[PDB]
């Protein structure tokens, strides 16, 4: 129920008779998201008017994420909205902060544009000497997220960042390492020098620093195994009290680098399986694959990890059914209960599986004896006959 004053305010908002700025729209959206007493999201004709005011306003005053939040709260109610693209600064407007803002808006609002990225890079080349140490790392991160191919500029930024080793902290070092590892074309000399920097300040690392360094090492590959060595020993004194996701990243790195020292691998796996119950679906799947690839799935190991994966098997992602099916085979252990619920889950989502996933699932289930007396064979036969065009 809307009283006379509230009714008239709502009508003025609905009729586009009120000039709203971006800040006022943000305040109204925040109030709506916080308190639902007035039913703002339950009036389509009011939210549509607010969106119309949003389009015709100056969105540059608010931060990029504020515009993204307005767009998100308009999408949630059912309105197709998108924040406006920012223009490249011109003439006196070129400053490091204004150029970083363009990349930040492209990131947050998901409006990636290769042409404006190239223009911003060409504008930022001459004034690269005015950047503060933090802005260089911000630029490296923003360019890493946008999947930029200009590895030369990222290498220049990495050299300038690494010139300031003393100023940077552990978190900044780890973020720079992972961002550089994500860029494909970086010259290996810069990566070697950055990994040398990471090798020192090793004890200053926090769990997030460990996760970032492990992600960078996973992306880089076996050529940096020596650096990974300095990780494992450094993690040998803290393994008994470590996060589960950190141990999963450790196991993934062990699988990737093809580590040779089996004692450390056994120690890390034995510490992981103690807290393996705290892992999410994706982390548990990756840990299960990594343990299989290192020839470490004993009877207790497989039983303990399957007991944990059965919990997520009920509503498993389609991308996770095939892997655990592969791990269930090639091992001499009893996994009847796991395979039953996995086959049932595969039956449930037979109409959304892609051609590759359906073919993979059928390939693993081809030689399984209990899979013949199942509706899945007939349902998958019909689905494969339908999907032969996309195979």
């Amino acid at each position: 129920a809307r009283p006379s004053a509230l009714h008239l305010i709502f009508e003025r908002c609905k009729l586009n008779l009120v000039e709203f700025t971006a800040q006022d729209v943000y305040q109204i959206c925040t109030t709506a998201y916080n308190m639902d007493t007035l039913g703002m999201l339950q009036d389509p004709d009011f939210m549509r008017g607010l969106h119309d005011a949003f389009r015709r306003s100056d969105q540059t005053v608010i931060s990029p994420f504020q515009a993204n939040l307005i767009a998100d709260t308009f999408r949630k109610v059912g309105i197709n909205s998108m924040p406006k693209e920012v223009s490249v600064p011109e003439e006196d407007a070129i400053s490091p902060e204004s150029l970083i803002l363009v990349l930040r808006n492209m990131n947050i609002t998901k409006q990636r544009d290769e042409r404006k990225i190239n223009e911003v890079l060409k504008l930022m080349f001459p004034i690269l000497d005015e950047f503060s140490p933090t802005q260089l790392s911000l630029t490296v991160t923003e360019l890493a997220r946008l999947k930029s191919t200009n590895a030369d500029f990222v290498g220049k930024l990495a050299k300038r960042i690494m010139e300031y080793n003393d100023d940077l902290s552990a978190l900044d070092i780890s973020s720079a390492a992972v961002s550089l590892a994500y860029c494909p074309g970086i010259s290996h000399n810069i990566l070697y020098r950055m990994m040398q920097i990471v090798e020192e300040r090793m004890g200053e690392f926090q769990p997030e620093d460990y996760i970032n360094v492990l992600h960078a090492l996973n992306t880089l590959g076996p050529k940096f195994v020596n650096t990974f060595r300095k990780i494992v020993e450094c993690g040998l004194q803290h393994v008994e009290n470590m996060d589960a996701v950190t141990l999963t990243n450790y196991m993934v790195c062990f699988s990737t680098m093809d580590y040779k020292q089996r004692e450390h691998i056994d120690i890390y796996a034995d510490a992981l399986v103690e807290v393996a119950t705290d892992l999410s679906e994706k982390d548990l799947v990756m840990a299960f694959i990594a343990l299989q690839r290192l020839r470490l799935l004993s009877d207790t190991m497989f039983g303990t990890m399957a007991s944990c994966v059965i919990r997520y098997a009920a509503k498993m992602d389609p991308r996770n059914i095939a892997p655990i099916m592969d791990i269930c085979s090639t091992v001499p252990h009893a996994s009847d209960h796991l395979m039953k619920v996995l086959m049932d889950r595969a039956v449930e989502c037979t109409r959304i599986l892609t051609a590759n996933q359906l073919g993979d699932i059928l390939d693993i289930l081809g030689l399984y004896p209990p899979a013949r007396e199942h509706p899945l064979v007939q349902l998958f036969g019909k689905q494969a006959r339908l999907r032969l065009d996309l195979m």
Binding site: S187, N218, G221, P222, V252, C253, Q261, M286, G366, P369
Partner: protein, 297 residues
């Protein structure tokens, strides 16, 4: 495993190759087509890439550009192959097209007087064998030992220097590994000498040695992924019999014209192992190569 080959240029195929032996271009083209089909029929290779033709007949030797030492793609010094320099460029773009490395390591190029020829490096289990012959100087040996040689209990990589005479061919043309244990070598002076040297430098090790007829070119993809495919020349039946009796799968390949031009099967292919960068703590699916549900049946 991606295998790169280049089509011959029919117009500029020499009328007679080294030693004045006459060659037939039509049979060369037919044999190259058969070789491409044989490479495609190999189960281990993921893809076979065919680069466009180039005027020089020397451009067919694609493996001369670089070598794969572990996870490092080392580029040979551009000392005696200046006229091939641009050709190498046209080959790297192909490697960039298939999702391979952005660029090769230039460790050998930077070093002074470091003559090395790809093909004197043999990828033995847990190490590499290099040949100290005319094609490779002591400087290249020292640089390779400084780079890839590591002595540790489990992180061990060995670089073996195998001396050879001046008239010897490249080590890869008569010395190699097959399967996981078999050693393929020629029953010639150089092959026996290399086998004896490798036995001397790696004692207390049991392995099988298989002797092929001299001049019988072979090609065997030895690496992490086990295989039994050993390509061999068609004429030599006894080499095929020996390889079959060693527990491998010989694949006879007609290689007359390329042999009479001095090019071998190893030098005509560029086998590179590509991977996909894993963003974050994410593992990538791998194709199966064994039996499933062994316990059940």
């Amino acid at each position: 495993l991606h295998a790169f080959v280049r089509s011959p240029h029919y117009r500029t195929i020499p009328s007679a190759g080294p030693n004045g032996i006459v060659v037939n271009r039509d049979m060369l083209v037919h044999q190259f087509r058969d070789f491409y089909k044989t490479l495609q029929h190999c189960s281990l290779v993921d893809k076979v890439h065919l680069m466009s033709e180039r005027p020089s007949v020397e451009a067919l030797r694609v493996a001369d550009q670089m070598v794969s030492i572990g996870a490092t793609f080392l580029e040979m010094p551009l000392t005696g192959m200046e006229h091939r320099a641009t050709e190498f460029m046209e080959s790297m773009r192909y490697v960039r097209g298939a999702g391979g490395p952005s660029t090769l390591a230039s460790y050998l190029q930077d070093t002074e007087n470091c003559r090395c020829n790809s093909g004197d490096v043999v990828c033995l289990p847990n190490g590499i064998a290099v040949g100290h012959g005319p094609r490779t100087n002591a400087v290249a040996h020292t640089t390779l030992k400084q780079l890839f040689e590591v002595k540790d209990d489990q992180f061990s990589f060995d670089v073996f220097t195998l001396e050879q005479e001046g008239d010897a061919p490249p080590l890869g043309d008569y010395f190699g590994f097959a399967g996981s244990n078999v050693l393929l070598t020629w029953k010639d002076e150089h092959g026996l000498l290399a086998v004896d040297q490798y036995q001397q430098k790696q004692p207390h090790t049991e392995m099988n040695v298989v002797y092929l007829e001299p001049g019988c070119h072979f090609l065997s993809f030895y690496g992490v992924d086990h295989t039994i495919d050993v390509l061999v020349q068609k004429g030599y039946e006894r080499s095929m019999d020996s390889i079959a009796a060693a527990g491998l799968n010989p694949i006879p390949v007609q290689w007359s014209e390329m042999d009479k031009l001095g090019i071998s099967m190893r030098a005509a292919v560029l086998p590179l192992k590509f991977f996909k960068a894993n963003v974050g703590g994410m593992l990538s699916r791998n194709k199966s190569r064994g039996a499933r549900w062994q316990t059940h049946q």
